[PDB]
Amino acid sequence: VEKGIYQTSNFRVQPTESIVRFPNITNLCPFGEVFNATRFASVYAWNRKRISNCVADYSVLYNSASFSTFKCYGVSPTKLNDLCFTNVYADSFVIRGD
Amino acid sequence: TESNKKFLPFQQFGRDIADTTDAVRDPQTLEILDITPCSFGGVSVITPGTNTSNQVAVLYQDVNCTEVPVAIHWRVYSTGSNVFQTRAGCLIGAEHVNNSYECDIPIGAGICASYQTQSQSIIAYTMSLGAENSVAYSNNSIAIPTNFTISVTTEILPVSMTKTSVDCTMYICGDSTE
Amino acid sequence: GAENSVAYSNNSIAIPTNFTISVTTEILPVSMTKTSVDCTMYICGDSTECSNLLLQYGSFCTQLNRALTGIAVEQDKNTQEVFAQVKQIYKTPPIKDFGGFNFSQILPDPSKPSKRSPIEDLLFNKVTLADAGFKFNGLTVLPPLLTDEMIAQYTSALLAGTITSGWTFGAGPALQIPFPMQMAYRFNGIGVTQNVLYENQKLIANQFNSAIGKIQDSLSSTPSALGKLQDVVNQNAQALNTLVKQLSSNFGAISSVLNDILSRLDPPEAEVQIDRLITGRLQSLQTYVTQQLIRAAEIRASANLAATKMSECVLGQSKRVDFCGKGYHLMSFPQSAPHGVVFLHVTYVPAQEKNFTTAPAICHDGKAHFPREGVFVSNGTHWFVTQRNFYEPQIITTDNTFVSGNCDVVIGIVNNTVYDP
Amino acid sequence: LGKLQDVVNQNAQALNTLVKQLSSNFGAISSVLNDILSRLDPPEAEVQIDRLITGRLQSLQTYVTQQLIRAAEIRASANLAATKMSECVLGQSKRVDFCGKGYHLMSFPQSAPHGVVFLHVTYVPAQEKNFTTAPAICHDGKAHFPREGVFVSNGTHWFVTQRNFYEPQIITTDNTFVSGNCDVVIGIVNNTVYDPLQPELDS
Numbered sequence: 001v002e003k004g005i006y007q008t009s010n011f012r013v014q015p016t017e018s019i020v021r022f023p024n025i026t027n028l029c030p031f032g033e034v035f036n037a038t039r040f041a042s043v044y045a046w047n048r049k050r051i052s053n054c055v056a057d058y059s060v061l062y063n064s065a066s067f068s069t070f071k072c073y074g075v076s077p078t079k080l081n082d083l084c085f086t087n088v089y090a091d092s093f094v095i096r097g098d
Numbered sequence: 099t100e101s102n103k104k105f106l107p108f109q110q111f112g113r114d115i116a117d118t119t120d121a122v123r124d125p126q127t128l129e130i131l132d133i134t135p136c137s138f139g140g141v142s143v144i145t146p147g148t149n150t151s152n153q154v155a156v157l158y159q160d161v162n163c164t165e166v167p168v169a170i171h172w173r174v175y176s177t178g179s180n181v182f183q184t185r186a187g188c189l190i191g192a193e194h195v196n197n198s199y200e201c202d203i204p205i206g207a208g209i210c211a212s213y214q215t216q217s218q219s220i221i222a223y224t225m226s227l228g229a230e231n232s233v234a235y236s237n238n239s240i241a242i243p244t245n246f247t248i249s250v251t252t253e254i255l256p257v258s259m260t261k262t263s264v265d266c267t268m269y270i271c272g273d274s275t276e
Numbered sequence: 277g278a279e280n281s282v283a284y285s286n287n288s289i290a291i292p293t294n295f296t297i298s299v300t301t302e303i304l305p306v307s308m309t310k311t312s313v314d315c316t317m318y319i320c321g322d323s324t325e326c327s328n329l330l331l332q333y334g335s336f337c338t339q340l341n342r343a344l345t346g347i348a349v350e351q352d353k354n355t356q357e358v359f360a361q362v363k364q365i366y367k368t369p370p371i372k373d374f375g376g377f378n379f380s381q382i383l384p385d386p387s388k389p390s391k392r393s394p395i396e397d398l399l400f401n402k403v404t405l406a407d408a409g410f411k412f413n414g415l416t417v418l419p420p421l422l423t424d425e426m427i428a429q430y431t432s433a434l435l436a437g438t439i440t441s442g443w444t445f446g447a448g449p450a451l452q453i454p455f456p457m458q459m460a461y462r463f464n465g466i467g468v469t470q471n472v473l474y475e476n477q478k479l480i481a482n483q484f485n486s487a488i489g490k491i492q493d494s495l496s497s498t499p500s501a502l503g504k505l506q507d508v509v510n511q512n513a514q515a516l517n518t519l520v521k522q523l524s525s526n527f528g529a530i531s532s533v534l535n536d537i538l539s540r541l542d543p544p545e546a547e548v549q550i551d552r553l554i555t556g557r558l559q560s561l562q563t564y565v566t567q568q569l570i571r572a573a574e575i576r577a578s579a580n581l582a583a584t585k586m587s588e589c590v591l592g593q594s595k596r597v598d599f600c601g602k603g604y605h606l607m608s609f610p611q612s613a614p615h616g617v618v619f620l621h622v623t624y625v626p627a628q629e630k631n632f633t634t635a636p637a638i639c640h641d642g643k644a645h646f647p648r649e650g651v652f653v654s655n656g657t658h659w660f661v662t663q664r665n666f667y668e669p670q671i672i673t674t675d676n677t678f679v680s681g682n683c684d685v686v687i688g689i690v691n692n693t694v695y696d697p
Numbered sequence: 698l699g700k701l702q703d704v705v706n707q708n709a710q711a712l713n714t715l716v717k718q719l720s721s722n723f724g725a726i727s728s729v730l731n732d733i734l735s736r737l738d739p740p741e742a743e744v745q746i747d748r749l750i751t752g753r754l755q756s757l758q759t760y761v762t763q764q765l766i767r768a769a770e771i772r773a774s775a776n777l778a779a780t781k782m783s784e785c786v787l788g789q790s791k792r793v794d795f796c797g798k799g800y801h802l803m804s805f806p807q808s809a810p811h812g813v814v815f816l817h818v819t820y821v822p823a824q825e826k827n828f829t830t831a832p833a834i835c836h837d838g839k840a841h842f843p844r845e846g847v848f849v850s851n852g853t854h855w856f857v858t859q860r861n862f863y864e865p866q867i868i869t870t871d872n873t874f875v876s877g878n879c880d881v882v883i884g885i886v887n888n889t890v891y892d893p894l895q896p897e898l899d900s
């Protein structure tokens with residue numbers, strides 16, 4: 001290295017501790033109740049249910065892998081448990097396999 | 099930090115020009131919090147030629163000398179024991195001086211460094227424009243030279259550079275048909 | 277422009293009677309802000325996944341940083357090629373007698389905390405640094421080497437060696453000389469004999485003083501005077517703003533915030549989204565750097581002319597036309613402005629014209645006579661040889677004229693009597 | 698010889714960088730075209746090769762743009778060397794600090810790898826001595842100004858001397874010219890101006 005002043009890199013201070021804040025609601029979201037319905041509505045008239053003011057244990061739902069295909073096109077299933085949502089709407093109906 | 103944003107009842111997050119969040123409202127307590135990135139800055143190593151020595155100084159650009167020890171690039175590098183302040187930043191490993199010399203390694207903001215012997219150390223000082231001078235002006239006084247000198251001074255200039263040709267197809271594909 | 281005509285006639289000349297001393301300002305840029313960007317922080321914003329993905333693209337980052345560092349060093353070179361032409365630092369004498377001339381407006385003012393001159397104060401107020409725009413996103417601004425008080429010292433050393441030394445302090449050891457004697461040589465430089473000054477010293481001094489005074493009013497009245505420097509600032513600040521806004525664009529990704537993409541999706545699907553942002557931001561950085569390279573080339577081309585006007589007009593009288601002032605150049609003074617330099621070119625301009633009949637020879641006794649230095653002109657009854665640029669008749673004698681040939685060969689020769697001293 | 702040397706490095710370094718750009722994935726599975734071709738069929742090899750093509754095309758564009766800017770910079774110095782040759786070498790230059798620091802006398806060219814070296818010869822005054830000067834000289838009710846030179850006195854006598862090499866000369870009429878009457882110029886001083894013609898008439 002020849003005489004001079006060289007910009008080797010940039011320094012960033014490191015975090016000390018992690019702090020997490022979440023709205024806490026005693027109610028647990030009735031996700032199971034949506035799938036517990038004895039009879040689903042007709043396909044031409046699908047049923048819509050809104051879920052709010054509760055805590056959703058997506059981890060339990062995912063681990064309770066009773067579903068064949070469970071894919072989310074805008075989110076990853078693993079990240080769902082940590083992530084939080086504002087408005088949740090479940091649309092239930094019946095279709096064909098194809 | 100605590101802030102004076104004055105959020106509206108239906109408003110949750112602030113925003114920045116670059117679409118980066120810079121204000122929130124704690125969900126549990128409705129107090130308004132202002133978010134700031136943690137301190138950062140470039141690090142510049144001032145070094146004499148490795149042939150001359152292997153001792154160097156470190157400049158933290160526009161950072162507080164009180165905060166430099168908190169920084170993580172490594173080595174503490176004798177923080178506190180040898181610290182100098184300047185408008186460019188905090189300089190560590192350099193010894194201040196009151197004499198003014200010519201500039202050798204320009205640190206900036208008028209501060210220039212050098213590697214002097216006194217057995218050697220890096221000294222950071224204020225560069226000198228030149229030797230002070232004065233002219234004895236007087237409305238009836240002139241000065242006429244009595245002797246001269248012939249001086250030959252060199253002047254170097256570029257006039258051209260290498261003529262290079264690159265074959266696009268050979269470079270990109272390397273003689274492959276696909 | 278206004279229609280005009282010249283009453284051309286093959287035996288008609290016009291020799292001006294009075295003159296004027298006019299001080300005209302000229303503004304030049306000399307450097308630009310020394311911005312410096314950190315590729316990795318800008319593109320990735322301190323995320324490990326993005327930082328790893330950015331490694332595949334090669335050494336774009338290092339060759340962006342090399343270009344920006346080259347520009348930054350060029351700026352410090354430009355700021356020093358202009359002002360640092362003086363070997364030493366001179367000091368103006370405590371006594372201010374200069375034969376009538378008044379430099380109080382240009383020389384340093386001791387009263388102020390900084391040794392600026394009043395005109396320098398006006399210039400620094402008009403072009404307010406960081407007037408427009410100028411940033412946690414890896415963009416930083418480095419300080420110039422010369423602290424803006426060393427620039428004042430340089431422009432005062434130049435201006436205090438010009439007053440007492442003249443053109444000599446730039447070509448050897450500075451030699452003192454009274455100012456009213458220096459102007460008598462600046463006058464010979466333009467083809468006007470020296471006696472024109474000493475005889476009209478008082479009027480010339482007052483014209484110079486008033487001309488200097490009007491500069492402050494002209495600068496104060498119009499805010500756009502220094503626009504040429506101001507534009508530079510804007511062109512830089514504007515650019516930076518654009519670059520920053522480029523961080524809010526999707527470029528095709530689901531979102532423009534890296535954290536949201538990372539938290540929504542796992543790496544297997546987040547790689548595709550992040551790659552588009554990396555490509556877009558890399559393209560934006562390349563655009564910014566190329567524009568800065570071209571703009572810096574332009575500024576360098578202007579610094580190379582500022583450093584030439586400093587050498588040929590501040591440190592000596594210039595014979596080039598319309599190079600240093602509109603008129604016949606007499607001298608020049610520098611002033612420092614934010615990111616630039618302002619010259620005050622002093623020039624001589626003839627004012628009042630009167631026309632006569634002129635003949636190119638004088639057949640005294642069969643031998644033509646041509647004037648050594650002057651023009652033959654007659655008011656109708658007598659013939660006089662007059663210097664070209666200031667009407668001053670003088671009886672014709674052998675000292676002003678030299679003989680070459682016979683009378684029949686020439687065209688337009690006219691009879692007359694040439695006195696014999 | 699830094700300047701010339703610098704040029705070479707600026708070019709060489711660039712080339713090196715360009716060559717190294719051939720070892721980068723740019724997102725492809727490999728940076729070697731042969732490996733991609735020999736491990737994958739064209740239907741899947743097209744996707745991989747497109748990224749390498751885009752990356753290398755971008756690198757070539759970067760190189761060419763940098764070379765264009767650098768060539769403009771070099772042309773700006775060729776156009777100044779071609780002016781120094783025209784005005785310094787082929788004639789004497791009156792421009793200040795153009796053909797060397799001092800009063801220019803001549804110059805000599807020399808070739809160097811990718812450049813030219815001038816040897817500007819210049820004149821510089823060395824030793825200074827100061828005197829008392831007066832703008833005019835009132836012989837008898839007539840101001841006298843020096844035709845070419847400046848008045849200076851060593852304390853007892855007045856001499857008109859050229860302004861760049863001290864050389865006193867007795868003041869006479871031939872090197873001074875008259876304009877007006879005394880008492881109109883500040884600083885005029887009494888003195889006697891010799892008459893070259895008078896002694897001959899007396900003789």
Ligand SMILES: *[C@@H]1O[C@H](CO)[C@@H](O)[C@H](O)[C@H]1NC(C)=O
Nearest residue numbers: 022023024025124125126127
């Ligand atoms: C959260 O917990 C706190 C505990 O102090 C409680 O006061 C608050 O009502 C809870 N609600 C939300 C929405 O966070």
Ligand SMILES: *[C@@H]1O[C@H](CO)[C@@H](O)[C@H](O)[C@H]1NC(C)=O
Nearest residue numbers: 161162163164183184187188
């Ligand atoms: C550091 O911050 C202090 C105030 O806490 C300030 O006075 C000083 O100028 C800052 N910069 C330094 C110490 O380099």
Ligand SMILES: *[C@@H]1O[C@H](CO)[C@@H](O)[C@H](O)[C@H]1NC(C)=O
Nearest residue numbers: 193194195196197198221223
């Ligand atoms: C430099 O001068 C300052 C006062 O101007 C003084 O406090 C300091 O001790 C001096 N340092 C040296 C090394 O002489």
Ligand SMILES: *[C@@H]1O[C@H](CO)[C@@H](O)[C@H](O)[C@H]1NC(C)=O
Nearest residue numbers: 244245246247248822823824
């Ligand atoms: C002028 O300078 C030369 C060179 O140094 C010296 O030899 C000479 O004596 C000086 N004086 C003259 C030439 O009167």
Ligand SMILES: *[C@@H]1O[C@H](CO)[C@@H](O)[C@H](O)[C@H]1NC(C)=O
Nearest residue numbers: 293294295296476479627628
């Ligand atoms: C000569 O002309 C100038 C410039 O127009 C004027 O100011 C001056 O009064 C005129 N008369 C003189 C100098 O005697």
Ligand SMILES: *[C@@H]1O[C@H](CO)[C@@H](O)[C@H](O)[C@H]1NC(C)=O
Nearest residue numbers: 372377378379380381485489
């Ligand atoms: C002109 O000179 C006088 C006397 O030195 C001084 O008082 C004055 O400030 C100078 N300039 C102006 C614009 O008044």
Ligand SMILES: *[C@@H]1O[C@H](CO)[C@@H](O)[C@H](O)[C@H]1NC(C)=O
Nearest residue numbers: 283284285288629630631632
């Ligand atoms: C002299 O100038 C006047 C205007 O000042 C003009 O009217 C006149 O025609 C001119 N005379 C000649 C002979 O050119």
Ligand SMILES: *[C@@H]1O[C@H](CO)[C@@H](O)[C@H](O)[C@H]1NC(C)=O
Nearest residue numbers: 654655656657658659660669
């Ligand atoms: C021309 O000037 C001379 C100067 O001696 C004067 O005698 C003469 O009257 C003038 N002629 C005219 C026509 O003005």
Ligand SMILES: *[C@@H]1O[C@H](CO)[C@@H](O)[C@H](O)[C@H]1NC(C)=O
Nearest residue numbers: 285286287635636687688689
């Ligand atoms: C000037 O033009 C006139 C027009 O009548 C002509 O007679 C005369 O010869 C010309 N004189 C010169 C000196 O050209």
Ligand SMILES: *[C@@H]1O[C@H](CO)[C@@H](O)[C@H](O)[C@H]1NC(C)=O
Nearest residue numbers: 639683684688689690691692
């Ligand atoms: C001058 O006078 C002579 C006669 O003395 C005459 O022939 C001649 O034409 C006159 N002028 C010129 C310019 O020839």
Ligand SMILES: *[C@@H]1O[C@H](CO)[C@@H](O)[C@H](O)[C@H]1NC(C)=O
Nearest residue numbers: 234236239240825826827828
């Ligand atoms: C002449 O120059 C000397 C230095 O060479 C200086 O000390 C002295 O004051 C000057 N004399 C005059 C009368 O200007």
Ligand SMILES: *[C@@H]1O[C@H](CO)[C@@H](O)[C@H](O)[C@H]1NC(C)=O
Nearest residue numbers: 850851852853854855856865
């Ligand atoms: C000035 O020079 C003259 C030249 O004749 C000489 O006679 C005289 O002594 C000198 N005076 C001094 C004071 O050196």
Ligand SMILES: *[C@@H]1O[C@H](CO)[C@@H](O)[C@H](O)[C@H]1NC(C)=O
Nearest residue numbers: 236237238373375883884885
């Ligand atoms: C020069 O300045 C002195 C200072 O005492 C003054 O007396 C004298 O009149 C001035 N002379 C000239 C020619 O300016």
Ligand SMILES: *[C@@H]1O[C@H](CO)[C@@H](O)[C@H](O)[C@H]1NC(C)=O
Nearest residue numbers: 835879880884885886887888
């Ligand atoms: C010259 O001498 C005369 C006669 O004593 C005197 O009136 C005058 O003031 C002196 N000075 C000048 C510059 O003429």
